[PDB]
């Protein structure tokens, strides 16, 4: 199912699937469709999303096996408030460590831009404001620049992902063995 909250075969993840998910959110000024393909060799178990800005009405997909991708979404808080969708998703991996993913889709593009990041944290660590600060300010996040970026994560893993630049945002990440 190309529906937020679903887990799909990981080879099925791509821009078309995420655009469907994004569109299905409707007319909201700032929104995101997130897809993350687990090709890490270990099962992932959802912990939480820390929403610095915005909300989601989707259950964070609980179990994501190797060879599956998760689909997710978020959107700005409702009403005229001039805020975006910003947060960190945290999954526990079966080795006892944490996969964290930052997204930032800001309201005001005169000052801010789209960013994303991926990091592995040692141990089981829920997403929170400190994790957000680290990933957004200190751990060299990638711009949502309509381009692909790759980086090693340690722990025998690497990441490759893409985010666009606008307020109707797609974030596609693949986690693979190094
Ligand atoms: C990410 N940020 C909070 C530093 C700026 C953009 O967030 P927002 O105020 O538009 O929600
Ligand atoms: C994300 N960053 C803090 C590394 C660079 C600043 O980007 P922004 O908050 O001005 O968009």
Numbering used by the authors: 2 to 179
Please give me the paper's original passages concerning this structure.
Fragaceatoxin C (FraC)11 is a potent haemolysin of the family of actinoporins, defined as a group of ~20 kDa protein toxins produced by sea anemones. Actinoporins are classified as α-helical PFT (α-PFT) because the transmembrane pore is predicted to form an α-helical barrel. The lytic activity of actinoporins on biological membranes is enhanced by the lipid sphingomyelin (SM) and by lipid-phase coexistence. Here we reveal structures of FraC corresponding to four different stages of its activation route, namely the water-soluble form, the lipid-bound form, an assembly intermediate and the transmembrane pore.
The crystal structure of a dimeric form of FraC in two crystal forms at 1.57 and 1.60 Å resolution sheds light on the initial events leading to the assembly of the pore. These two high-resolution crystal structures are virtually identical to each other. Suitable crystals were obtained in the presence of POC (a compound that mimics the lipid headgroup of DOPC and SM) and the detergent dodecyl-β-maltoside (DDM). Two molecules of POC are bound to each protein chain, occupying identical positions to those of the headgroups of lipids L2 and L3 in the crystal structure of both, the transmembrane pore and the DHPC-bound monomer. The protein–protein dimerization surface and the non-covalent interactions observed in the dimer resemble those between residues of the β-core region in the transmembrane pore (rmsd=0.4±0.04 Å). The structure of the dimer reveals a localized and notable conformational change with respect to the monomer (water soluble) at residues 14–17 of the N-terminal region. In the monomeric form of FraC, the side chain of Phe16 is inserted in a hydrophobic cavity of the β-core region. In contrast, during dimerization the residue Val60 of a second protein chain displaces Phe16 from its original position, leading to (i) partial unfolding and increase strain in the peptide bond of Phe16 and its neighbouring residue Leu14, (ii) a displacement of 4.7±0.1 Å of the Cα of Phe16 towards the solvent and (iii) further structural adjustments of Gly15 and Asp17. Because the N-terminal region is glued to the β-core region, partly by interactions between apolar residues, the rearrangement of two large hydrophobic residues (Leu14 and Phe16) may facilitate the detachment of the N-terminal region towards the membrane, a necessary condition to generate the active pore. Second, the serendipitous capture of a dimeric form of FraC exhibiting a similar protein–protein interaction interface to that of the pore, suggests a mechanism initiating the self-assembly and metamorphosis of FraC.
